[PDB]
Point group: D2
C-alpha cells in the first residue's frame, strides 16, 4: 500500500507517538491543546509532531510524495475575538522551536523574513491580523499557505466561527504540485477553500516532520487551539 | 479496514467493473467520456456506475456509512460555452436511466418535481442555466447538491475553466450529516467549495449504486464531460 | 492506493454486492452458508458482485492479492462431505452444467481442460476412492488449477465445528500462492505454497468468491464463511 | 481507518524513520542488514525499530490492538551452516539493547531467565541450537514464539533454505489472542507455520516499539540476516 498512513480519533494524555514542544499537551478529555488553556490565561506557544519522520521526496529516484490529511479543530475565544492562530506544517525532521519565536509566528519562524533555510511549509488559520504587530497579514481572519515565511504566498478570508468545530481536508497532489485546503463548519454549512502551487522538492529536505503549532500572543485576548482528531497519509 | 475502497488511475476500454448506461464509454486514451464525443456532434445522455452496490446504511444496527470520493474531470467546450453538465450520484442499487430523461436532468430524473420516490442524491456541475429550458437553475454556472430533485437544495457559483482539469473531493461525515464538495483547478488555483446537511438514511435505500452521469442537450453547444480518475471509499 | 479492497465483518440477508448461485445464501445470524443447511444434497457459490482485473494485456502487469476469511465446517456425525473452496473464475461465471458436489460447482468434469480457467483453493473433506479417485488419502487443502485434481495438497487437520482463520496471499513477482490456515481454538495450523502464473491461466477480468457442496445428504456438514477481507493491486 | 499502517518496499541508507541499534544498518542496495556483513567477518548484534511507538492496548477502554506484519528476509551462510538467527519483536517503547546481551539472545535478553519485567514478545528464526551454548533451544533450526524469555513457549522445525528469500506473514487477532506465523519460500514451495495464544495486555506495556533484531555469535560460522521489505499495520 502507501508509504504511511495513521489515524487518531482521539488523543490520550502523554501519547508516546506525538512529540510535544512548548506548551502543547493533551487534556484528559482526549483533545490536543496545542496552546495552553489554564486557570489564569497566559501567553503561550506550542507544537505537536508525529514521532516519526516522513520521506517527502527521494533524491535517488526523483519521486515526490503526495499526501492528504484531515483534522477537526476548535478555536474558542472568551471575548468575541482571540489570538493568534493554529497551523499545520511540514518542517525538517525532528525540528525544534526556533529561538525567539513569536506567537504570531506560530513557533515556526525566528523572524519575519523569507529565508530559504527555514524549510517550512505550513497552512495557517490566522485569527489575529493587527497592523501594529502583524504587518504582513491581510485585513481579516484568514487561511494562508506559508512557504519559508510568515507572509503567506496566498490567503483567503476565513469565516471563523467561535467555539464551533471545523473540518479540514488538505491534499497535495505531487504531479500537479497542487496544495488544496478544504475547510467547513458542519454547524451552519460555512465553507472556505484555497489552492496554491508548491514544489516540495524545492523547499523541503528529503525527510520531514509533520504536525500542528499555534500561539497566544496576548493573554488578554485568549482563545483555544484544540485539535480533536487527525488523519494523515503520504505516498512516494 | 473499511467496508469498501477502490481506485481507478485510468480507465480501460470496456472496463468490466463499470456499468455503462446511455452513451457513456471509455476512449482508447483511458478516459471515461460519460457524454459521447464525435466528429459530427450529437445530443447525448450517459451514466457510468461501479458494478457492485454499496451498503450506505444498515436497518439492523441503524449505522449510516461515511464516504469520501475523489476524481478529476474536464469539460471542454468548442465555443466559449457548453451544455449541460456532469454529476456524481448515489441512486438505488443497479438503477437504470429514467424514461424520458432530459440532458438538463443529467439522466437522473423523469421530471422536474421533488418526488420522494426518486431516491437520488447527486452533486451536479451544471454548465447550462438558461431560464427558457432550465427554470430551476440559478443565474450562473454552478455546483449543486441535489436531493430527489433537479432543483438543488444549495448551490454555489462554479468558476468553470474551459478545457482545464478540475480536482474534486467529496466527503460525507455520517455523524454530522455533513456533505462537503471541494473543487479546485491546479492550473490557476481557482477553488470552489460547498457544504450541506443531508441525511442519507432518510433519502436513500439500504443498498445504493454510485457513479457519474451527464448530458448534452443541444448538439450546437457541445462540450465534453470526461472523468480522468476516480477514488472512492465508504465505511459503516 | 490499491486497485481494490473490501471487507465484510458479517453478512446481511440478501447482501446486494454478493451474487448468489445455487443454494448459497446468508442466514439471519449474518453468516454466509455457501451450502444449504436444513436436509439435502446441495451446491452453492457466492461471488463478489464486481469483476476484478487480475492482469493487464496493455502493460503486462499481473495483480498481487491477499484475502482473509474465517469459516466453520460442522458435521452431524464425525465426518462430512464435501468441502469448501475459494476461487477465481472468468468474470460473472455461472455454475457449470452437470457439476458434482465433489467438484464444488466449479467443474463440468474431472479433466484438466485449459478452457476451464479456474484457480481455486479447496478445503476437501471427502476423499473416498469410489467417487473422488483424484483426491489423496486424507482431508486436505489443495491448490486447483483448471482441474479438480489439485496440483499440490497438504493434510488438513480439520476440527469439527471449530472456526478456522485463513489467509491467502499471491505475490505476483514470484508467482507464489500461499495458504495459511489456523484454528485459534487449539493452535492447529496448516500451510501450503505453490507456483501459479495467473496470466497463463485466467482471463484479464475475473470474479472471486466461495463455492462448496454436499454430495450425500446422509453425511451432512455446513460450509459457513463468517467474514471476508480481500484486496488486489496491479 | 486503522490506527497505523506503514510499508517499506526497500530501505534507504540512513532511513530516518528507523532507529538503528548495534551493528544494524541498510546497505546501498537498499537492504536492512540487521547483522553486520563485512570482510573479514566479525561477531555482531543489531536491532532496527520503527521510529514511532505504537499503542498496543488501552488502559482507559481495555481495548487490545490486532496487528499484522509482512516481511521478506534472507539468511545466507558461507558454509552449510550459520548462526545465530533473526527475530521480529515488540518491546517497551524506545527500548535499548540490554546490557551484556548474547547473539544467541538476539540482543533482546540480559539473561536466560523468564523475568516478567523483560516485557518482550518476539518471533525468532533460530539457526543455532547447540546444547553447549544454547541449552534452551530444541534439536533443530526453528521458528519460535518468545514471551519474556529466550526459551520459546512453542517452536516448530524451520526448513531453512540457504540464501533463499523467505516470505513471512505474522497476524495477531486480539479477540482470540491468536498469534500466527506464516513462512514460505517461493523458490521451492517450502512452508512452515506456527500458532500460539498470547495475551499482549498481560505481557506488554501500553506503548511498544516494533522491529527486528539478530546476531552472529561466532564469526567463523557467519551468515547474513537481511530483511528486504516490511509491511505493518495495527488497530485498536
Ligand atoms: C556463552 C554463549 O555465547 C554465545 O554462544 C555462541 C557461541 O559463542 C561462544 C564461541 O563459540 C566461543 O568461541 C567463545 O569462546 O565463547 C562464546 C560464548 O562465550 O558460538 C556459537 C558458534 O560456534 C554460537 O554463535 C553460539 O550462539 C551465546 O549465543 C549464548 O547465548 C551464550 O551466551
Ligand atoms: C512583538 C510581537 O509580539 C506578538 O504580537 C502579539 C499579537 O500576535 C497579538 O497577540 C496581540 C494582541 O493584542 O499582542 C501582540 O503582542 C507576536 O505575535 C508578534 O509576532 C511580535 O513578536
Ligand atoms: C425542454 C428542455 O429541453 C432541454 O433543455 C436544453 C438545455 O438543457 C440546453 O441543452 C439548451 C442549449 O441551448 O437546449 C435546451 O433544449 C432539457 O435539458 C430541459 O430539461 C428541458 O426538458
Ligand atoms: C452420485 C455421486 O454424487 C456425489 O458423490 C458423493 C460424494 O461426494 C460423497 O458425498 C459420498 C459420500 O458417501 O456420496 C456421493 O454421493 C458426486 O460428487 C459424484 O460425482 C457423483 O455424482
Ligand atoms: C532563529 O532560529 C535559528 C535557530 O537555529 C537561529 O540560528 C537564529 O539565530 C534565530 N534567530 C535569532 C534572531 O537569533
Ligand atoms: C420517470 O422515471 C421512472 C423510472 O423508473 C418511471 O417510473 C416514471 O414512469 C417516469 N416518468 C414517466 C412520465 O414515465
Ligand atoms: C461443462 O460446462 C460447460 C458450461 O459452459 C459446457 O460447455 C459443457 O457442455 C459442460 N459439460 C457437459 C458434459 O455438458
Ligand atoms: C540486563 O539488562 C538490563 C539493562 O537495563 C540491566 O538492568 C540488567 O542489569 C542486565 N543484566 C545484567 C546481568 O547486568
Ligand atoms: Ca497573525
Ligand atoms: Ca442545468
Ligand atoms: Ca473431494
Ligand atoms: Ca539459538
Ligand atoms: Mn497570516
Ligand atoms: Mn442546477
Ligand atoms: Mn481434493
Ligand atoms: Mn530458540
Amino acid at each position: 500500500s502507501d508509504d504511511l498512513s495513521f489515524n487518531f480519533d482521539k488523543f490520550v494524555p502523554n501519547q508516546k507517538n506525538i512529540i510535544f514542544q512548548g506548551d502543547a499537551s493533551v487534556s484528559t478529555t482526549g483533545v490536543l491543546q496545542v496552546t495552553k488553556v489554564s486557570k489564569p490565561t497566559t501567553t503561550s506557544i506550542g507544537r505537536a509532531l508525529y514521532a516519526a519522520p516522513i520521506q517527502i521526496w527521494d533524491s535517488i529516484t526523483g519521486k515526490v510524495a503526495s499526501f492528504a490529511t484531515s483534522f477537526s479543530f476548535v478555536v474558542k475565544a472568551d471575548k468575541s475575538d482571540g489570538v493568534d492562530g493554529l497551523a499545520f506544517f511540514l518542517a525538517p525532521a525532528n525540528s525544534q522551536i526556533p529561538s525567539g519565536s513569536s506567537a504570531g509566528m506560530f513557533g515556526l519562524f525566528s523572524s519575519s523574513d523569507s529565508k530559504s533555510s527555514n524549510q517550512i511549509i505550513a497552512v495557517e488559520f490566522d485569527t489575529y491580523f493587527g497592523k501594529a504587530y502583524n504587518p504582513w497579514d491581510p485585513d481579516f481572519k484568514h487561511i494562508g499557505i506559508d512557504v519559508n515565511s510568515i507572509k503567506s504566498i496566498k490567503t483567503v478570508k476565513w469565516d471563523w466561527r467561535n467555539g464551533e468545530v471545523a473540518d479540514v481536508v488538505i491534499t497535495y497532489r505531487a504531479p500537479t504540485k497542487s496544495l488544496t485546503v478544504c475547510l467547513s463548519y458542519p454547524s451552519d454549512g460555512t465553507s472556505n477553500i484555497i489552492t496554491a502551487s508548491v514544489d516540495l522538492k524545492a523547499i523541503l529536505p528529503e525527510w520531514v516532520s509533520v504536525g500542528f503549532s499555534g500561539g497566544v500572543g496576548n493573554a488578554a485576548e485568549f482563545e483555544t487551539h484544540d485539535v480533536l482528531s487527525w488523519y494523515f497519509t503520504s505516498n512516494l
